[model samples]
Target: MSKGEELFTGVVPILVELDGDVNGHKFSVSGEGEGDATYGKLTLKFICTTGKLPVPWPTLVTTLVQCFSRYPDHMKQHDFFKSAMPEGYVQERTISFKDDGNYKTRAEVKFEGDTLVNRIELKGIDFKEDGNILGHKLEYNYNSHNVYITADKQKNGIKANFKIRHNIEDGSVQLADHYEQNTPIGDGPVLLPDNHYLSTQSALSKDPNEKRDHMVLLEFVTAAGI
Candidate 1:
């Protein structure tokens, strides 16, 4: 998918999970995205957490994901931001390979522009196994992404999980910021059966008013929520 519109129209429901490190900070990532090519609004949501960094560090991961979506093609060697990029910031990516017919290179992102300069780094990414990084592992656009996490070897520090799902139903699509409940709030049953499950709440608001909720597709479901 080269253009955002093309990707959206081509891949309506997509999912991706990427786990690695950002500048020595091990992280796992999960994100799902979809877009309205006609309206021109792409929705993406992801959560990257690391046991090595502090609280604000996880937030940093989220910001990086957002930037990636905004400028889907900006990471191509020498590309600039197509939209507002943190006022003044740039993201860099470096990769390296090992002597076992491999090298290691890390990419760094520097945020320096007219407004604010935010320096963000996502480095030290290595596959857990040898053949894991042998081929192309991702395909993405403003609408969707297909990635896998292969960096779950960090002993301590930051660990991240990025899992995203796009549910395309009706004129709406569910992408990120969703949860499931099997019982009521005040007086809920101890456990619900398979056929008797509760609804899953989907967010339909960009910057969804909540602390850790981000997305703009609010809906309800019965299957499950993540």
Candidate 2:
């Protein structure tokens, strides 16, 4: 091993204690650094864990990095510490809307490893002239295949090209709601008015004037549980 690799290897099997777990798991982090810490490889192993079986590597590494980041003195000892880390970690964001009554919609985005998954659910209640209330529901799921993201000075958000399908007891209708928009990302929960096109479309509502009790709220959370 080179001098850099030797230096990094000396710090092998680092331990981290994750919060909110009884007797937190022990993480063994081993890695090699090369070329003045410009490039390297890393591996992690965990023991005494209590989560789901076959814990994902992404989760393990994410937790380790998060925990280690808190200890600047320990990490600063090695030049390759930051260079060897992953570009991004697991994340989850959820947007939800609801009215005073039964109308509601929910949208969620999750990063599993390097893949992005989007799920949307909508439900509404309509009252007929005869005083009967009818319920309608819609659900959609978008994986990395159908979803894309654009980042630029003008816009930065996740986008997807999808078709909307409406199925009734007697007939069905398909609408072309192709790729044409992006939802804004904010540091905190972003609220959109009820009349907003995205909110209306997500709730599967036809009347733009319909007043919902609440706005749609969107937020992004990191793997650090923030």
Candidate 3:
């Protein structure tokens, strides 16, 4: 939480809590961030995947980045190109696993100038019996990631081919929406239950466009095609 500083604006919606032990035990992590620069702010890091185990790769990579915000550029630009992670400064990564199961680590991201640092691949992480992460599949790089991946492999190579980037700035912390969702246990019914269960779609633009709309107290909820 003390890297290089510069992530201004008191750190817009940022939260990255981490804790891990691997070989010993103890695991607890949480991540969610925002900050992108159209001129000033940057760093739309979500190096999140939630942790603690029992299947918590930072909450499955923030629910695959909030289900990729329904895509569209994470639904109309969820900033930093939504998820193309890493764009400059520096980067490196490596992952390997396969002894039985429970693919533990292998999620790395690197960038120095604006900062976007995340690592997890200590002999290919693992946590079971109660912890979680039992599949395995992750590798990373972004010495300057502008976000681009036609296919580096994540489906069959095992899993986890995640890469999204905004590449530093915007001070350093942002979590636009903030966590709150895990009410899915099962109910099953209604082709629409009356309809409209649609929510969660925050995080938009900021990389060449962020005046906060001449802020007067912006709360804009307008939808027709943001």
Candidate 4:
């Protein structure tokens, strides 16, 4: 199949496993791609099945968005597109965590093929109270950062890895963040043995430790054109 045809022809199913406070929680992706080879539209919905609410939800959303944005294009079309756009491609979705309720996330990303420009994300938690069952409060949080991706073609599939630098007030700073994925083109949902760690340094610090505020382990599974 042609490059464009291969990507736009089918759905890419993604699986996410998170550890730490939200251990045993798994999020599955139902994704579809539209458009031609040059430019295409990809939409994905992440749903949590092994429900224990993912705290500080923005982290989870950011990981998934940045990971898929690289896709196969980054490796195949690296030189075609340079310079990242100021206004990157954006995706918004509402993710439900069984009975724990639902949260909405917006992911904005700027990239040139596999190279990441910048990423900004917003997450809002919506929940109802016992006293006011009719009304609920939506609290929103925001985060921005830049990501770098490197890929290796393995015997079984492509191994894509990432490093992240979080944005502070003036510029971006390095963080102890790590992400890895082994993706196959148009194949079965393969589970990775190792866990992807996010924000490991800060999470382990005594001053910054909290039940809801800590590092997370992300397990990945990818199936192409499903």
TM-score for each of the candidates: 0.26, 0.21, 0.23, 0.32
Model 3 TM-score is 0.23
lDDT of each: 0.28, 0.23, 0.26, 0.30
Backbone clashes in candidate 3 total 44
lDDT of 3 by residue, 1-226 (tens): 1111123223344333444445454545444454332122323433323332432233233222211122222222222112233221111222212222222333333333443444333222444433223322221211221121221122211112333221123332211121121111122210111111122222332234532211011111211132
1 or 3, greater by lDDT: 1
Best TM-score goes to which candidate?
4
Ranking by lDDT: 4, 1, 3, 2
Off by over 4 Å in 4: 1-4, 7-52, 62-147, 154-156, 164-176, 185-226
Model 2 ranges with Cα > 4 A deviation: 1-106, 111-153, 158-162, 172-226
Per-residue lDDT of 38-105 in model 1, one digit per residue for the tens?
A: 23233446544333321122222223322222222222211121122222122223322221111122
**Model 4 agreement with the true structure over 1-226: per-residue lDDT tens digits:** 1222233233333222322222323233221122122322223333333343344333354444333332243233331111112123343434443233343444443333533322323233343232110121112223333333233335332233344333333343323233333333323322222222222111111124433332232222221220
Candidate 3: segments with Cα more than 4 A from true spot: 1-11, 25-34, 37-142, 146-226
Q: What is the lDDT of residue 217 in candidate 4?
A: 26
User: Model 2, 151-189: lDDT tens per residue?
Assistant: 222332333233333333234332223342334323322
User: What's the lDDT for residue 215 in model 2?
Assistant: 16
Least accurate 10 contiguous residues by lDDT in model 3? 214-223
Candidate 3 whole-model C-alpha lDDT, 0 to 1: 0.26
- Give the lowest summed-lDDT range of ten residues in model 2: 196-205
Error of 4 at 75 (Å): 7.4
Residue 167's lDDT within candidate 4 is 30
